[PDB]
Design a protein around this nucleic acid. Structure first.
Lengths: 250, 217
RNA sequence: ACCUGCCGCUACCAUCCGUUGGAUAAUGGCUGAACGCCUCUAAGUCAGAAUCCAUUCUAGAAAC
RNA sequence: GUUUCAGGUGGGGAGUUUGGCUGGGGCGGCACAUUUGUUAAAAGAUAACGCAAGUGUCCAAAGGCAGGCUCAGUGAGAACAGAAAUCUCACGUAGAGUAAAAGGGCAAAAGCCUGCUUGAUUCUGAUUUUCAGUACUAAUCGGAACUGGGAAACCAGGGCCUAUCGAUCCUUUAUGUGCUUAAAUCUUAACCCUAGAGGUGUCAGAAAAGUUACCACAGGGAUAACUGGCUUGUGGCAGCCAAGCGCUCAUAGCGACGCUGCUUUUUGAUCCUUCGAUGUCGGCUCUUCUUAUCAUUGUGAAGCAGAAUUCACAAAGUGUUGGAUUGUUCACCCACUAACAAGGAACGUGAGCUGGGUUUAGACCGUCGUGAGACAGGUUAGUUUUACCCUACUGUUGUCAAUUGUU
RNA sequence: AAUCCAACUGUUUAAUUAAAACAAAGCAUUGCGAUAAGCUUAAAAGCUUUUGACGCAAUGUGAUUUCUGCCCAGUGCUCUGAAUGUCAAAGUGAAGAGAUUCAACCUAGCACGGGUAAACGGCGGGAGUAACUAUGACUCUCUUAAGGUAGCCAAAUGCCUCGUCAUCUAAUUAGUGACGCGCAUGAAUGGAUCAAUGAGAUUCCCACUGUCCCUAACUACUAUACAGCGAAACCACUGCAAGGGGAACGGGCCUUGCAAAAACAGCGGGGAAAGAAGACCCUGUUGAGCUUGACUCUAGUCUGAUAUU
RNA sequence: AUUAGCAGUUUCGGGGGCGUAAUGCUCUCAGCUGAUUCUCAAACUCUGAACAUUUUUGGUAAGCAGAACUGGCGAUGUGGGUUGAACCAAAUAUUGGGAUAAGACGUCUAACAUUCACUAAUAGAUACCACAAAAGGUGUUAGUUCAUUAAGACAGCAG
């Protein structure tokens, strides 16, 4: 009948969960989101820190603890701490509530990254925004994977759109025409950003430099010269394209 | 600490609890280094001893200590070199902190976990100082009674409580003053190892001066 | 039962109307020391908020 | 067949049971009988589910005794033999060993080795320990028999010492030219007397499985589930120092490694109130308050040219939305917007509502359970009672019983 | 327009559950030839039985359609089963003066062997393996007998989960169609399908719509006023706030703010308002209902034996 | 339990350097030994004293849980701490006078005078007890120490 309080039916903890199934029994443990990764990398932080709780779970969502009877039937021991370590080591990461959200984001991130590395619009070699690229990649259709590397996936993505469209999988070379007085500042921004070659400096004449950068970086380059100088800057292509980048196939 | 606010273990409470055969599970200390600059240098080189004494009786953490020492190590290159510094810290973190964790930090229970067996797992360490304990000694040349003072000032901010700072009247890491030390040196009663004076006795040395007097400063 | 329907009631479903002085804060200044110089500040003083207090508006006191 | 005994089967039926401790109860554990070090504060006693460990045994030698000898380790020598086999010698306060945990004890020993033995024997008194100065365990001290060892003094109540264990009843054994069997008497039988063993580990000692969401009763705020209270680890917010980022440049804006606070808008912690009853969640509605200011006002910083944006102050005066999905607060999206800031008021607001959920009984599925049933899993259906009292508020009369003589 | 469920009609929790529950025809299993099987009664006797296998009794499943796989190790049921292992009382033999003691002999069940899953149920893990390391046919071993076949599915069964993909919306924790190492689907514990039907559950669109934007107006009867009649709950005393402290949320206390008759109509902020010795929770050496391979019995039943003989 | 250099080894374990090269010679470097050095303890010790306060264990903490001593509260008022179970004074037959205690003495409120600083805040004001910190201040008050100065300091202004 009507009670003065709730019946209490919540045991949902929002920390990370590492899953290991053995002997027809799923086993989980409460760890943190960052620490599991660290452990698997080989970086020590004791078992006190990586484990949020030192007792073995059947289900972290339900909050059902594994009995000694069960534990000994799977791992050949009833000591929980030891089991936890084992779970951490050989088991795979399982998404909790927080982690589900992250998962959703992850895909978005990957597409943003992998697709935007190397490309140009059809007809001539010019830079262009990521949204367009994304659209293009959707048209041809691509499914990202966390089991593959991002760099590896980039190549795959470009493969599809090399067949379909005209694109640039390699670097290009630029040529800027800088003044002698106002150009020094500009140069110092550019030098650590990208590789400078063919640097011809004069007093009586204007300063000339050439760059090595990807097809999407031209825009980035040209823009930062204008606002820093406070005048227009002449952008010319030294080459429309040049070898290496994702053309050497890393 | 990183796990908790150091204000949880601000002050010395409970009996001293140390890494032993009765407390083997403790994690390793944050500082495993009690060194700064040229330790090989002789006590006869650097005659100035700038200390830092904790004005409060408190539990000054390992992490805090670590923070302090690097602050001093980042006030070695900006002023002088490494060959004007020396530091044994003079405060190790022997005491170890217990932490009774709770499962339901974000979750829930109707007092299931609780304190039914409340013992705290060892996590962290700490150094138990007093109102006149030295927590950083800097032996140095007499050309730095400003820079090691200001190094130690920086350190002071890393620590809990008020922190006095003092320029000694001794040669650093030695019982003797500067008026007495000098006297000894003049007389040939002084004697040096490497970064520590031995000093030649007259009680142990009744008639055996053929080693002490040979290596006098 | 249905159509139309005044009076009335009502709708940003229609219509009308909704003020201006002083004093401050923040801050910006002034004259100006302590501290021969300096400085918005210590004495002093100026401007100044949808602020505040009045103006206005509502009630009208075992108050006149 | 029936009758009477016998053995089997027999939750079809009957009666019962289903430990205690416990930062609620359960799961877990044993702090339930016991031992060492510590907690324990220089006598003794002293608590927690305080800490680090241990006990239910093992030993005809690992018992008793006498004698000889010295161990751990280290150094230097010795065909095979090296890092390591065995044989010397020097040094060697015990760092070795002594059944096991740990603490103590221990060197012509309590260790090692050898020999001989059964004091690991019987009767009896007193005492110690826990303590009630009861029992039990364990121990100690003496006396009397009978022995062992030793030249003898001496030692020998088993284990160097501190743990290593057990009532009544019942059974059984040992003991005695034992006593009794009540008419007498002999035999067996049984009873008794004295000492052991068989054992109760919930260890001063019941024969004992579950479930109940169909449930009940006596109680409990000695105790859970909401509120508030302390508390603030966790959540939230703020400060300080400044290694660094910020092309340059610590602090325009950020800020490591650290440290110091605050808040009670998180969740815990606790159990103080309430269990002869404070209606739990969310939403709608409505008001007020907070500022930790999202917008608007006035300002000040900026890596503030412009536009745009970010940072800070005075300011809470005025605003702070419509929707899809979900019971959902929360979440996530769409659209508007100057902005769509965060919060409190018994987690504001059930005699204001709704009842979507939680949260009774019906039922389905999944997993579990032999089963009854379980589920903090999913699903579907499921009564929302009373104001007319008091105050509070909204308005309405009416007395200012001189409204100041009356109207 | 669709999805879930139940075939339909029907039925049920009188006073909170009308359902997807129950029933149902259909399918299937079991016992039984009369001194039957089943059942009742203390006994005597009785029912089923005015019955006779196309029947009665006892179960399961649930119309139709289409299928209904593998497993008999466990528990339970069963047997044209083999031993003397176990085996009580009566009876038999020995020892004794006898009470008695000890021996053989020995039934049913029991152990042992078999059958049985449209009985209850179950339908895995750990190793290697197609130069493919994915997938794992195949092989080996273990648990415990076999190891999920056909189907089906984030389904009323999926924790993770708001799974992923498509579609439906501007936007969808919803819905549907796909995918399916499926925490924990699955074959009369019935699986899959499904017309017609449904006061059953869910989603969508069209129309309609005061549900809403956003309220307004109208009517009767209440209420209200009046005559007449005229209750009850409830009730320590009581009734203004603020803070403080206090049993940690005061009407009283303390210190403040204040405070001016007597009443009316509204109202829901309080009075931790009223109704109820809290159904939750725990305790008690308190119960009851139900279960079972608790403890202890027991009707019945099976078998053996004495007597009747 | 833990930090540091140093000496003698140094040929050695290893890197080289050194005479053409070596268990030959010396370094950093490890290892061994010696004398110094940093720090260290519920479960170490040579040594070793005398509900509230104090001692004190778990706990981040609690108006949390648990112990020791003493005194209270409960069982107990009275005066004081505005209020209050435990604080302070101080114990309770019924009264009068006296003089006190804690605590007060602008007014509430019984009780005042004199006197020296400090505070320029809307502060601050009866222990328990109702909070507050690290860190800042060319606010003022006092104090410490050091340096400069009639050789022209200091400040300004000028070269």
């Amino acid at each position: 009948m009507s009670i003065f309080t709730p019946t209490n039916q919540i045991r949902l903890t929002n920390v990370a969960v590492v899953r290991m199934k053995r002997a027809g029994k799923r086993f989980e443990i409460a760890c943190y989101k960052n620490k599991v990764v660290g452990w698997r990398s080989g970086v020590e932080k004791d078992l006190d820190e990586v484990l949020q709780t030192h007792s073995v779970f059947v289900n972290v969502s339900k909050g059902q603890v594994a009995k000694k009877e069960d534990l000994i039937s799977a791992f050949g021991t009833d000591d929980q701490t030891e089991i936890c370590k084992q779970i951490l080591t050989k088991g795979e990461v399982q998404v909790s509530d927080k982690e589900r959200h992250t998962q959703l984001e992850q895909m978005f991130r990957d597409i943003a990254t992998i697709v935007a590395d190397k490309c140009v619009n059809p007809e001539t070699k010019r830079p262009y925004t990521v949204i367009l690229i994304e659209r293009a990649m959707k048209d041809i259709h691509y499914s990202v994977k966390t089991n593959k590397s991002t760099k590896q996936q980039a190549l795959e993505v470009i493969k599809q759109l090399k067949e379909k469209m005209k694109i640039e999988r390699a670097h290009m070379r630029l040529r800027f025409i800088l003044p002698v007085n106002e150009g020094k500042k500009l140069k110092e921004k550019l030098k650590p950003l990208i590789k400078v070659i063919e640097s011809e400096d004069y007093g009586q004449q204007l300063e000339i430099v050439c760059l090595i950068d990807p097809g999407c970086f031209r825009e980035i380059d040209e823009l930062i010269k204008k606002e820093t100088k406070g005048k227009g800057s002449l952008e010319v292509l030294n080459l429309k394209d040049v070898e290496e980048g994702d053309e050497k196939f890393e | 600490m990183g796990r908790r606010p150091a204000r949880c273990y601000r002050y010395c409470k409970n009996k001293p609890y140390i890494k032993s055969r009765y407390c083997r599970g403790v994690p390793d200390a944050k500082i495993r280094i009690f060194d700064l600059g040229r330790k090989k240098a002789s006590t006869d080189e650097f005659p100035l001893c700038v200390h830092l004494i904790s004005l409060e009786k408190e539990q000054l953490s390992s992490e805090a200590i670590e923070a302090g020492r690097i602050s001093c190590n980042k006030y070695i290159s900006k002023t002088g070199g490494k060959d004007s510094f020396h530091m044994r810290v003079r405060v190790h973190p022997w005491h170890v902190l217990r932490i009774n964790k709770m499962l339901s930090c974000a979750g829930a229970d109707r007092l299931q976990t609780g304190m039914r067996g409340a013992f705290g797992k060892p996590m962290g360490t700490v150094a138990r100082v007093n109102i006149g304990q030295i927590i950083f000694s800097i032996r140095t040349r007499d050309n730095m009674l400003a820079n090691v003072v200001e190094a130690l000032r920086r350190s002071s901010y890393k620590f809990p409580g008020r922190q006095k700072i003092v320029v000694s009247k001794k040669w650093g890491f030695t019982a003797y003053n500067r008026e007495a030390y000098q006297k000894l040196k003049a007389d040939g009663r002084l004697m040096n190892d490497g970064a520590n004076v031995k000093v030649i006795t007259n009680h142990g040395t009744l008639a055996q001066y053929a080693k002490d007097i040979a290596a006098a400063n």
